[PDB]
Amino acid sequence: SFGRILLKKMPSVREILEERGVDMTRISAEWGEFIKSPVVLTNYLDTQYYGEIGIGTPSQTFKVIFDTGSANLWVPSTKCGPLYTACEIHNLYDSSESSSYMENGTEFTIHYGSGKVKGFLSQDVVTVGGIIVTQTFGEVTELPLIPFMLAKFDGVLGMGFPAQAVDGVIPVFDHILSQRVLKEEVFSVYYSRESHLLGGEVVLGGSDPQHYQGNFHYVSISKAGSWQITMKGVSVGPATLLCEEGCMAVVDTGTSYISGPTSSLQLIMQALGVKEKRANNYVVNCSQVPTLPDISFYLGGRTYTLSNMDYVQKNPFCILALQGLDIPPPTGPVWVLGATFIRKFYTEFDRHNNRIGFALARAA
């Protein structure tokens, strides 16, 4: 258990609002917006998994999201003022208790779907999966209410490329690579079946052979500075409907729902046999779930199939784990294979070869 980080299941901000009796129209309209330098593919509304890291000497524990969509580490600060009530329900980084703290002070702004996180940079020791790196990270002093007033995670560990990082900060994984401690310059991400207790695993330096079956097959990165691959077909049932001419697709551990363009996804929802739409999202009567056809994605000359049980979430109060999202050019129309895709297919992110590997996930 050297370079492994146990991911733990948490109620998502949608699931917290659902359990408090909030209407599905209100949740999407007020907590799930996508506002018009690096690209945003998530609002953390549906994120269900966090890992724990330590920051400082002695180490102060934080619950963080492992987000391949971003390249920055940030956590709430004790410098976070009284105007930001969201800070008052989370763990706070206190430089006063760290002997390894070294100030920087340059301001940063990280944009995401529902809003923006502001603060200042600071250097300290960071322990992630038993590996100690000297990291520059964001001390957040302006944490917005949407969605962090109800989030069950403190902050975000970016697992993206250094080109995506704000203020040109060297990311956490890049520092781990500089140390030459890992067997491979890769990390892989496992989510187990959607249960109440069962969690997941991020492995640094390789892949856990317990959590996959058969063999990995790899797809090259098509855009240099991100986990982005060419998709050559989206199919409902036997019929291939979209992406024959070639779609860009991001594999993102940050968001759990698969994203596509609103027009392309509405076409899929028609052919799926699904009428009801709430903003970006699509709800369905739980009686008609077993009759839904399989969705498939064509990646690196192989099909990756999601069955009815893989892309639907039953919560007490059934919602499809797909949603509309239009990123404009030059970045272009993009799909996002979120954690729903990765739960089915154990994913290896490869930094040396600049490629992404997929394999059929399983339990032990």
Site for ligand NAG contains 73 (CB under 6 A): no
For residues 107 and 244, which CB has a smaller minimum distance to ligand NAG in the complex?
107
Q: Least distance in Å: CB of 7 to ligand NAG?
A: 28
Tell me the sheet residues that pair with 334: 248
33 lies in the binding site for ligand NAG (CB under 6 A): no
Integer angstrom CA distances of residue 243 from 164, 207, 239, 303 = 26, 30, 12, 13
Q: Nearest distance from residue 92's CB to ligand NAG, in Å?
A: 21
What is the C-alpha to C-alpha distance for residues 126 and 19, in angstroms, rounded to an integer? Answer: 35
Phi, psi of 15 (to 5 degrees): -60, -35
Q: Quick check: 100 binds ligand NAG (CB under 6 A)?
A: no
- By CB under 6 A, tell whether 37 contacts ligand NAG: no
**CB closer to ligand NAG out of 28 and 135:** 135
For ligand NAG, the closer of residues 41 and 73 by Cβ is 73
- The reply on whether position 121 binds ligand NAG by CB under 6 A is yes
Residue 136 contacts ligand NAG per CB under 6 A: yes
Binding mask 3-32 for ligand NAG (x = CB under 6 A): ------------------------------
Q: Which is nearer to ligand NAG, 129 or 160 (CB)?
A: 160
Phi/psi at 297 (nearest 5 deg)? -125, 135
350 classed as catalytic: no
Q: Identify the residue among 25, 61, 85, 106 touching ligand NAG (CB under 6 A).
A: 106
Q: Among the options 46, 154, 252, 350, which is catalytic?
A: 252
Nearest to 42 by CA among 278, 254, 279, 324: 254
Cα 93 versus chain centre, distance: 23
154 is catalytic: no
Please work out the total of residues on this chain that contact ligand NAG, with binding judged by CB under 6 A. Answer: 7
DSSP letter, residue 175: H
State the nearest-atom distance from the C-beta of 119 to ligand NAG, in Å: 13
Residues sharing a CB contact under 8 Å with residue 5, sequence separation 6 or more, in sequence order: 51, 52, 53, 66, 128, 129, 201, 202, 203, 204
Q: How far apart are CA 251 and CA 254, in angstroms?
A: 9
Least separation in angstroms between residue 104's CB and ligand NAG is: 4
Catalytic residue among 46, 67, 154, 350: 67
Residue 117, exposed/middle/buried by CB under 10 A (0-12, 13-18, 19+)? buried
Considering the complex, what minimum distance in angstroms separates the CB of residue 267 from ligand NAG? 43
Q: Is 249 in the site for ligand NAG (CB under 6 A)?
A: no
Pick 167 or 326: Cβ nearer ligand NAG: 167
Tokens at residue 152, please?
A: 């069950």
Nearest distance from C-beta of residue 194 to ligand NAG, angstroms? 38
DSSP of 316-345, one letter per residue? ---EESEEE--PPTTT-SEEEE-HHHHHHE
Nearer of residues 106 and 263 to ligand NAG, judged by Cβ: 106
285's tokens? 């009567």
Residue with tokens 């105007």: 83
Which of these segments, 77-85, 163-171, 285-293, 347-355, binds ligand NAG (CB under 6 A)?
A: 163-171
Is 172 near ligand NAG (CB under 6 A)?
A: no
CA angle 172, 176, 179 (to 5 degrees): 145
104 part of the interface to ligand NAG, by CB under 6 A: yes
Is residue 70 part of the contact set for ligand NAG (CB under 6 A)?
A: no
**Residue 67, C-beta contacts closer than 8 angstroms, at least 6 positions apart:** 42, 156, 157, 158, 159, 160, 252, 253, 254
In the shown chain, the binding pattern of residues 183 to 202 toward ligand NAG, with x for contact by CB under 6 A and - for none, equals --------------------
- The SS3 assignment for 176 reads helix
Which residues contact ligand NAG (rule: CB under 6 A)? 104, 106, 121, 136, 167-169
Q: Which residues are catalytic?
A: 67, 252
